[PDB]
């Protein structure tokens, strides 16, 4: 269907403990494929999915080069912004960036993005037209000026439209057997008695990809979320995901309940019962 590539940059200062640490991670869809950590004994851009390992020496040195320039750029960014806000020399501060692109089922540019955050809140973002900026505050406006007078917008658009999309498609082709493949959740229901009168029924979805999924409980055929305990969808560590939803029910009434699971990997919605 539709696809995305995204890069996440984070720079966090540590006054009295060294120079700002810089970390980057790249994603295609829900799949991380690259990483960089300034604190690594030998900082380099490293592969996190089989289908990038094939990239040649010139790729990895170019990426490593880019990340080292990145850490320098964001270090300046932190220092400059720290000046804008006239903050105390005290504690840590953070500068984050997420950028990348969405391509439709046709393989064309749907939307490009490139937004920055300072200390966990929007700071400045490239608007959907890839030509203007939204400054979240007085300081970000100063930055806006600098970027407009430097023509940063055009530079970003050139990459978001061309390079970003091309390579996204490339990675998509190169990793097709996993990126364009959906794994269906393996589902079951567990039984946990609380007392002689109440028991918990937990409905599990394990080993699925992608992350997006839906779990719900029904009584006699009619919903009843408000009574349902979820956990946030979590990563198994094997690139797949997990989730459960539970409901406390009267001992003896287990039959009345059915768990319902919808996921891209299932031909048709599934129905479980204890």
């Amino acid at each position: 269907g539709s696809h995305s590539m995204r890069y996440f940059y984070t720079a966090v200062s540590r006054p009295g403990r060294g120079e700002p640490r810089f970390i980057a991670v790249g994603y295609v869809d829900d799949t991380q494929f690259v990483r960089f950590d300034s604190d690594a004994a030998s900082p380099r851009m490293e592969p996190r999915a089989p289908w990038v390992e094939q990239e040649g020496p010139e790729y990895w040195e170019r990426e490593t080069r880019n990340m080292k320039e990145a850490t320098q750029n964001f270090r300046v960014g932190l220092n400059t912004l720290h000046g804008y806000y006239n903050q105390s020399e005290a504690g840590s501060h953070t500068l984050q960036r997420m950028y990348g692109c969405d391509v439709g089922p046709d393989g064309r540019l749907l939307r490009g993005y490139r937004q920055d955050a300072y200390d966990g809140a929007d700071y400045i973002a490239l608007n959907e037209d890839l030509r203007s900026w939204t400054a979240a505050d007085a300081a970000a406006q100063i930055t806006r000026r600098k970027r407009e007078e430097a023509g940063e917008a055009e530079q970003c658009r050139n990459y978001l439209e061309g390079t970003c999309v091309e390579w996204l498609l490339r990675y998509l082709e190169n990793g097709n057997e996993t990126l364009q493949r959906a794994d269906a959740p393996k589902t079951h229901v567990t039984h946990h008695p609380i007392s002689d009168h109440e028991v918990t029924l937990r409905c599990w979805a394990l080993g699925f990809y992608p992350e997006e999924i839906s779990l719900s409980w029904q009584r006699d055929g009619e919903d009843v979320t408000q009574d349902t305990e979820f956990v946030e969808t979590r990563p198994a560590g094997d690139r797949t995901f997990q989730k459960w939803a539970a409901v406390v029910v009267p001992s003896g009434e287990e039959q009345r309940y059915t768990c319902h699971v919808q996921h891209e990997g299932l031909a048709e919605p599934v129905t479980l019962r204890w």
């Binding site: 790729y59 300046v76 990459y159 390079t163 970003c164």
Partner: peptide
């Protein structure tokens, strides 16, 4: 492929 444009703040 990461982006290699100049940054300003």
């Amino acid at each position: 492929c990461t982006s290699e444009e100049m940054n300003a703040f």
